[PDB]
Amino acid sequence: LPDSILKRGAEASKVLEEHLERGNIIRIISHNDADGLSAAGVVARAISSMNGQFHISILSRLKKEFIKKLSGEKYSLFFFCDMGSAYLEEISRLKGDVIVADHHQPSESEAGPHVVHINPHLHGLDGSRDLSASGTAYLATRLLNRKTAPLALVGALGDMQYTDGFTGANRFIMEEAVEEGVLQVHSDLKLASRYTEPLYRSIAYTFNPALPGLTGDMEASMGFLENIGVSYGVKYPDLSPEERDVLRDELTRINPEIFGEVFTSREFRNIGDLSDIAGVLDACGKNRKYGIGIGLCLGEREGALDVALELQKNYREELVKGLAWIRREGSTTLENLQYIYSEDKAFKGIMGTIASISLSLKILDPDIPLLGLSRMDQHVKVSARTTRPAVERGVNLGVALRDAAASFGGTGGGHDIAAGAMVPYRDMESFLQLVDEILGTQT
């Protein structure tokens, strides 16, 4: 990588150690998706391993008001994951030391001198591809605990940073984790929950890498498996070798991606591969069941796990319906983006995910950035997704949504390839065109 970062990391480990040695409790603030929860987990696990204590809050968006509420509180160290780069001035106004582990672009003023800021953008690395919050937290805790590297990669997968191989600092973290013996790599089919789910359901629930015709369609996948003569009520490992080969052959025909690298760790045995864990965390996060998510990251797997797996199941079911909806009513295309709108509470939480999946499946034109829109009474939650070719063409959704949302007194941001915003429902049209214009621009 560029050895610079590792250094910045170490600065942050030093600070962390200082405060732990003094007995003071560490305040952790993070985001509510796979990356945010796995980042919070990395840090809390590092603290735990030093017989230290931590206080975690999970937020869906960091707000100026919330930062002020903290500036009260008698905590000596604040650790921010997956947010904060946009509020560096405001955060600097905290009494007490601060670490910010984040991977969004600038944001933007200077960052005070009692604050440690780790961000791939600052070290010549791409925050959209080469590192996520969870990995940034690992670099911050790497000299204290290396057992956490699998979780670091959970967040990276969660944030869609696997682009045929891990790249940049994610590659570094993978390599290390192998070297430390806590991560194994296998070539295999990338099917959903292969250890806990019968083949027909596993195929239907393989949303990424997507399998057009089969993904999201229990009937068609059951059918498909009969047509090719492969048992559809057994779990993948309980198949015969011959059946495995025929299956590998026929699914690859539908999408070559389906076969490739698969990541496992003794830590997550009986649950899933690393991508599966990312899914379980997304389901916990979408259900504001943050405790279950973090418990899972720290190693709780008894009642918590049952609950977590049940939440996934529901999550998956909701995704199937959402995909069916998009197939039924289409999207309206403009000139530089397309969009999809729904007042159904069923889809509020999952709009971004079904957006992404629908582009992969090519239900919708993957060349055109897709804005999913869900009403929250007076406001509308926006979830924008596109693809890596579109980012190459110059698309930056994080920028477009931030600028546009501000214009109407809203709040928005993200990365080039995925972003979100919140705006008055009343301003939806105006909003949408403005993004349109902003779009065609950078393009």
Among positions 313-332, residues that touch a copy of itself (CB under 8 A) are 324, 327-332
Among positions 119-178, residues that touch Mn ion (CB under 5 A) are 132-133, 159
Q: Which range in 49-57, 162-170, 187-195, 414-422 contacts a copy of itself by CB under 8 A?
A: 49-57
Which tokens is 369 given? 């950035």
- 315 backbone φψ class: left, alpha, beta (φ>0; ψ -120 to 50): alpha
Q: Tell me whether residue 363 or residue 435 sits nearer to a copy of itself (CB atom).
A: 363
Among positions 191-220, residues that touch a copy of itself (CB under 8 A) are 212
> What CA–CA distance (Å, rounded) separates 426 from 126?
35
Minimum distance between the CB of residue 257 and a copy of itself, rounded to whole angstroms? 13
CA atoms within 13 A on the CB side of 41: 32
Binding mask 241-280 for a copy of itself (x = CB under 8 A): ------------x---------------------------
Minimum distance between the CB of residue 253 and a copy of itself, rounded to whole angstroms? 8
- Strand order of the β-sheet with 332-333 is 332-333, 338-342, 370-376, 379-385, 418-424, 411-414
For CA atoms 173, 175, 176, 178, give the dihedral sign.
Answer: positive
Q: Tell me whether residue 4 or residue 71 sits nearer to a copy of itself (CB atom).
A: 71
Phi and psi angles of residue 133, each rounded to the nearest 5 degrees, phi first: -60, -45
Burial group, residue 309, by CB count within 10 angstroms (0-12, 13-18, 19+): middle
Among positions 55-84, residues that touch Mn ion (CB under 5 A) are 82
Minimum distance between the CB of residue 73 and a copy of itself, rounded to whole angstroms? 8
Residue 436 labelled as part of a binding site: no
Which tokens is 368 given? 């055109």
- 333 contact, one of Mn ion, a copy of itself, none, CB 5-8 Å limit per kind: a copy of itself
> What CA–CA distance (Å, rounded) separates 353 from 412?
17
Residue count, binding to a copy of itself (CB under 8 A):
44
Residue 33 labelled as part of a binding site: yes
Q: Tell me whether residue 39 or residue 251 sits nearer to Mn ion (CB atom).
A: 39
Task: Say if CB 159 and CB 169 are below 8 A apart.
Answer: no
DSSP β-bridge partners for residue 263:
185
Among positions 377-396, residues that touch a copy of itself (CB under 8 A) are 389, 393
Query: Which of 4, 14, 18, 55 touches a copy of itself (CB under 8 A)?
Result: 55
> What CA–CA distance (Å, rounded) separates 125 from 120?
5
Burial group, residue 244, by CB count within 10 angstroms (0-12, 13-18, 19+): middle
Question: What type of residue sits at position 203?
Answer: I
- 159 contact, one of a copy of itself, Mn ion, none, CB 5-8 Å limit per kind: Mn ion
> What CA–CA distance (Å, rounded) separates 147 from 145?
6
- 240 contact, one of a copy of itself, Mn ion, none, CB 5-8 Å limit per kind: none
> What CA–CA distance (Å, rounded) separates 425 from 32?
23
Query: Which of 16, 174, 304, 438 touches a copy of itself (CB under 8 A)?
Result: 304
Breaks (C-N over 2.5 A) in the chain follow: none
Minimum distance between the CB of residue 56 and a copy of itself, rounded to whole angstroms? 7
Minimum distance between the CB of residue 437 and a copy of itself, rounded to whole angstroms? 11
> What CA–CA distance (Å, rounded) separates 220 from 406?
45
Binding mask 8-47 for Mn ion (x = CB under 5 A): -----------------------x-x-xx-----------
Binding mask 359-378 for a copy of itself (x = CB under 8 A): ---xxxxxxx----------
DSSP 238: G
Residue 377 labelled as part of a binding site: no
> What CA–CA distance (Å, rounded) separates 248 from 191?
11
**Residues comprising the binding site?**
31, 33, 35, 82, 103-104, 128, 159
- Contact positions vs a copy of itself (CB under 8 A): 23, 53, 55-58, 65, 69, 72-73, 212, 253, 287-292, 295, 300, 302-304, 306-307, 324, 327-334, 362-368, 389, 393, 443
**Residues comprising the binding site for CTP?**
33, 104, 128
